[PDB]
Symmetry: C3
Subunit: 347 residues, 3 copies
């Protein structure tokens, strides 16, 4: 929270956290210090009785490498928008894709989970993305309480140079063409919710030529999710079928993929919040003889102790169930277990 300005209908919210974090793992690419911090600003201005303008900015700053290292900070979110009361809201910039409106229900683990597992950042509309225009409608205007739907469009994010280039070029793993997404969530009963999400994007020419894995003109995602959040109990499950949209590590994309996440949590009155979860990502029809491969598969057990709204500490144990093989080695998929210890100050 930490509202630092609230004068003349203009509110400024300064949020962020400092996370002293350490990983223990046989994977040397993962083991070691993981300390980082986040800094953010939420701003809001009242234009008239029916119109409110807003903007948000979220910045990730790593603190686990030296003062001469490179690329230690990056923007997670940055968008400006207008809210027209019950009509809805629209914003554009770097924001979360609507697919995350459902898959975030399982992104509640102490440390692991979320982007970088079954889905990644800058991975079409599955997570945070560049240049997304998002329309959101709350409670179906004034009709149905708990019914939310969103419509989203994303412009092409092409290559660095060449015919498929845009001003903000990237590598094939983080490219996209013109695409759209839609999400729909409803609370059938108190504490129980169901959600659906769909996204369809054009694939770029470099995605079909540079990597060895993944061929197709369109990336598609079908997502369904459930949530129970009542009586100090949190239960969430999420199943997604992707087409030419799930990353197969360094090697490319999977032609088809089935991702599944499920998590169970309980919140004690004195602050402890133990958590158990299972995540898997099944790839199908891979090129170069890989065929059907496990991209992700692990069981997560951990807990978080909340001192208050500004301080917490946690332990997270990722029990990796992947078997080391040619695919995991060539794609760069980690198969070792990791234990995470964190102490977080939030503001």
């Amino acid at each position: 929270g930490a509202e630092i300005y609230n004068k003349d209908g203009n509110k400024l919210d300064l949020y962020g956290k400092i996370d002293g974090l350490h990983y223990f793992s046989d994977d040397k690419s993962v083991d070691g210090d993981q300390t980082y911090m986040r800094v953010g600003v939420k701003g809001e201005t009242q234009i008239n009785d029916q119109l409110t303008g807003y903007g948000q900015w979220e910045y990730n700053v790593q603190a686990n490498n030296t003062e001469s290292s490179s690329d230690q900070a990056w923007t997670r979110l940055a968008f400006a928008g207008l809210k027209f009361g019950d009509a809805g809201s629209f914003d554009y910039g770097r924001n979360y894709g609507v697919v995350y409106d459902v898959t975030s229900w399982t992104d509640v683990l102490p440390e692991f989970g979320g982007d970088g597992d079954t889905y990644g950042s800058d991975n079409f509309l599955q997570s945070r993305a560049n240049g997304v225009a998002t329309y959101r409608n709350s409670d179906f205007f004034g009709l149905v309480d708990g019914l939310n739907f969103a419509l989203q469009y994303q412009g092409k994010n092409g290559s660095v140079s060449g015919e498929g280039a845009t001003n903000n070029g990237r590598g094939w793993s983080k490219q996209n063409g013109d695409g759209f997404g839609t999400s729909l969530t409803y609370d059938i009963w108190d504490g129980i919710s169901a959600g659906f999400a769909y996204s369809h994007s054009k694939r770029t020419d470099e995605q079909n030529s540079v990597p060895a894995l993944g061929r197709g003109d369109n990336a598609e995602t079908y997502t369904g999710g459930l949530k129970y959040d009542a009586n100090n109990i949190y239960l969430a499950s999420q199943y997604t079928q992707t087409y030419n949209a799930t990353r197969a590590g360094s090697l490319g994309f999977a032609n088809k993929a089935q991702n599944f996440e499920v998590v169970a949590q309980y919140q004690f009155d004195f602050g402890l919040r133990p958590s158990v979860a299972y995540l898997q990502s099944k790839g199908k029809d891979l090129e170069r003889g890989y065929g059907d491969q496990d991209i992700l598969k692990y069981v997560d057990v951990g807990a978080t102790y909340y001192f208050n709204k500004n301080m917490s500490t946690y332990v997270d144990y990722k029990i990796n169930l992947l078997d080391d093989n040619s695919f995991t080695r060539n794609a760069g998929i980690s198969t070792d277990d990791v234990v995470a210890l964190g102490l977080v100050y939030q503001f």
Copy 2:
């Protein structure tokens, strides 16, 4: 604005904007998402009845690329200074060159214009620069503002012409100075003049193919009308070895001209029309006289209030594609910009 601290005579101002921006162009180096944000801090402390100290920092953060991209943020401004009441002020750090005291009068377009057009950043004293010492005097000890500015050498990465903060030839400079003078002859009518003289580095005279000379010079004159919901501003600058000729180097001499007309409606709409051109002369490699920049700008901005706005800007590029534009990398396509800005 958004002053967040004001206790015991010390004020701290937190300003900035978040700009959801998108470009439409046949030029692939320009087309696509352009979302960025800026965050800044203005600080002021009162030392005594006649002395006030201050510092400012302005930071640009791009938001149009991935979380693994590189060089997405940079400092636009960072300087500390002392104010001697009405007598004037002195400050040092990364600040605008005094040439911008006049050329900023035309830097009022919805999206385009300013640095990156007839002049650039780190381009001698034309815009934001490193290591500038600036003295400013108000009402000339009335209504007449004068500035004297000095900039230390900003050399190469290594070699004889190196400094601790080395750069490439396009953004290098030697020891230089500038001076500016603006006056309001009538209510709402202003005239300005600016001069700049800098030593050029050896790499600027050896590495690029275009531009040869020991000194960079700038002569600028400007007019501005700002009254009755009407804004009119014009600016003419003649440079010598100071206007960039794209990737190829500098123009030996160049004539830049900017003019803009705007109207502010009471309900928030602000349409804008402008014309910009950059004529390079006496270029090497057989180029001779070349158009570096030439376009007509039309657009408008709607201000919801002091914290929220939306704008569209259309750059009608009048440059003809030829050997010079292709080799220098100068865009000749049109650009359309759509933006939604939150300010704090």
Copy 3:
């Protein structure tokens, strides 16, 4: 200072400085504009009567290069911690090594001194380091007033690739293995203090193979310091003996080294604060025929004028006493004088 939030027992402090700085030197790697700024956040939350949580973040942003330059900003500090009253405190993240608890007594020069001289940043536990767990006890609980001790542990910070790698790899100069440190300072009077510091770390494989200078499995530092700070007079001395821990420029580490810093200052009532100091770093038993070599040696004279608590200006003159030879030339150690002019706004 500049506390911007203080509500419901949660305080947020926003600090920093803007330093308009210029160096004059025959050394082209040092001469020119050195303008930079610092921004920091100090946060504190009260959990209960006996427990307080906190976090701090410090960010360095250079302003002396262009808007197209690279790696102009980096994190100096980022850690989260808990205070259990008189029992002590613990924090983890990027923080100062306990050796600096003593050597900071001489880090009081107008511009020079500190990191980059006898010791550097990311240099085992001598200065700011990644992934340090620090326990600190003040006044020996409540029993011995003015007696402070600290115990510190640092995990391995290995290479970018290979067997000795961690997730946050660096080059050999800023690598470390598992290490620990301890510090002890006592205030005999309110202005007279004595301090001791010890540090022991395992060395990485790249530190013994890539550089030409410095061989050994363990890095050690022994530090003792004296300080007088009363009656507008500041006197401080610090002597450190290192083993395979002092950097010998580009060539590697010194097998053993003796560092000495001494500084004398006086504070006038009208704001002027003249300063004189001497710093030296004597290397011993260097390979390739270097033997005993001077790594650092200069006399510092300067002054700082404080306008108030938020504005200051200073001049600092480094009179370099190093003679140019084969070692200084090959290691890249500057032997020229430097004059610094600074104007600082603080918030």
